[PDB]
């Protein structure tokens, strides 16, 4: 499987150029909220 590492890097590099540019941060807009339960408090959230 070591012989395929160069191909993997090439494909990842090819896909990253398009992937990074035209994407919207769903986490930034609070579309992802399953991590919020770990570091936030209910009454703290309502007060903030």
């Amino acid at each position: 499987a070591s012989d395929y590492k160069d191909v993997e890097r090439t494909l990842l590099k090819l896909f990253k150029k398009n992937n990074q540019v035209n994407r919207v941060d769903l986490d930034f807009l609070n579309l992802v909220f399953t991590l919020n339960d770990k570091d936030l408090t209910s009454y703290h959230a309502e007060e903030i």
Partner: protein
């Protein structure tokens, strides 16, 4: 609520009077007077909250208001009353057993209203002065919009302050029970100090009122949610993922004991709800045999069941059944029957549908649609309504007429005409044996 124009978007609830008397037309429902009376009785039974474990069966032909009656009940119940709507085929899973799926569905229909009392101090820190040799000592001042106070800090409080790295102008909250320190955010006055801001920074106003405040909060959590949370160390993620597995029975018994303890101490309230199972005939005999006992638990919710099949063969058995359900389950079930609508009721339903879809029907088109409904089907006409609207719109005409309905009838077929064509052209369609004449000449 996020919604689009749907089939039951026009049913605001059961059109019942104060004495549970149905109106000729109200809240988007027409007819089914006996069924609506029964639904209101069921609603009062649910609201009362004393009667436990009652099964209700709704039977009748398709397109006779079973799902409509259930939707009306759901709309009438409103929030704060659980309402779990599941299909017969939803219980079949590759991860959960059928009994486990039913158990999770049942607990989802019961909600627990738990009260939490919180004591907090919140305010903007004005000055912090720390002296350290021996143990350290220091004084701290916190102000609000209408208060200011100087406090003396213990060693553990100072340690928490240091480990949180709090600075002046920050609004922080301290729980005097545990001493935990949370940084709410920064003041607006410090916003100018930088060009780019980190993810952690937050700008909030200074809290008002007294520095020390007491607040109690009520939380609504279902029994299934409590079991999942209390099973593993990260069950709250499974509450969304659904990969919860078959919770240990000892866990469920302990959770029942805990809920009883809270209710005895008066800090938790039970809000029983309604479980609606669509197409109950898709269940198996094992599921029904489990339901027979499961309906009889003290925490069982009130289960409504809707079926359209008549005397058919029960799944998992080799015999036919009155409704596809075992007699033991029907023994503990009261059956509500529905009757097909007449011409006037179909006319009223079509008028209601036209109003809901903001389509301007004409009287002659309405009569034609009612005639087509009584001849072929009500749902067929309901589906034809929008097609007629689009056909009229294409003709740069803002109103629907008879020609548009005729064109819709010609373009889109119904069940009867489709059967006529398939019987007339049996040679060009594949049959049960798989033979088909693809050639034409």
């Amino acid at each position: 609520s996020l919604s689009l124009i749907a089939a039951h978007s026009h049913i605001t609830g059961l059109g019942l009077d104060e004495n549970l008397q149905p109106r000729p037309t109200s809240e988007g429902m027409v007819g089914q007077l006996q069924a609506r009376r029964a639904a209101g009785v069921i609603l009062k039974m649910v609201q009362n909250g004393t009667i436990a474990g009652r099964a209700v069966l709704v039977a009748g032909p398709p397109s006779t208001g079973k799902t409509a009656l259930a939707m009306g009940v759901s709309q009438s119940l409103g929030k704060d009353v659980p309402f779990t709507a599941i299909a017969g085929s939803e219980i079949f899973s590759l991860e959960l057993s059928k009994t486990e799926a039913l158990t999770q569905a049942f607990r989802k229909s019961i909600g627990i209203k738990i009260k939490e009392e919180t004591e907090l101090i919140e305010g903007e820190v004005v000055e912090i002065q720390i002296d350290r040799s021996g143990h350290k000592q220091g004084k701290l001042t916190i102000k609000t919009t209408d208060m200011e106070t100087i406090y003396e800090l213990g060693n553990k409080m100072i340690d928490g302050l240091t480990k949180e790295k709090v600075l002046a102008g920050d609004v922080i909250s301290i729980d005097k029970a545990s001493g935990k320190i949370t940084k709410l955010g920064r003041s607006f006055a410090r916003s100018r100090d930088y060009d780019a801001m980190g993810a952690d920074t937050r700008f909030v106003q200074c809290p008002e009122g007294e520095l020390q405040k007491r607040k109690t909060v009520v939380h609504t959590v279902s029994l299934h949610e409590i079991d999942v949370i209390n099973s593993r160390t990260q069950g709250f993620l499974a509450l969304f993922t659904g990969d919860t597995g078959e919770i240990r029975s000892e866990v469920r018994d302990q959770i029942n004991t805990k809920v009883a303890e809270w209710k005895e101490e008066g800090k938790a309230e039970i809000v029983p709800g309604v479980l609606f199972i669509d197409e109950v005939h898709m269940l198996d005999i094992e599921c029904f045999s489990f339901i027979n006992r499961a309906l009889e638990d003290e925490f069982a919710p009130i289960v409504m069941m809707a079926t359209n099949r008549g005397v058919s063969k029960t799944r998992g058995t080799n015999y036919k059944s009155p409704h596809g359900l075992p007699l033991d389950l029907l023994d503990r079930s009261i059956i509500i029957t529905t009757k097909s609508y007449n011409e006037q009721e179909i006319k009223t339903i079509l008028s209601i549908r036209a109003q809901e879809e903001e389509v301007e029907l004409s009287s002659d088109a309405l009569d034609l649609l009612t005639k087509t409904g009584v001849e072929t089907s009500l749902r067929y006409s309901s589906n034809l309504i929008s097609v007629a609207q689009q056909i009229a719109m294409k003709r740069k005409n803002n109103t629907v007429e008879v020609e548009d309905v005729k064109r819709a009838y010609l373009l889109f077929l119904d069940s009867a005409r489709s059967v006529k064509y398939v019987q007339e052209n049996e040679s060009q369609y594949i049959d049960d044996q798989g033979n088909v004449q693809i050639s034409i000449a």
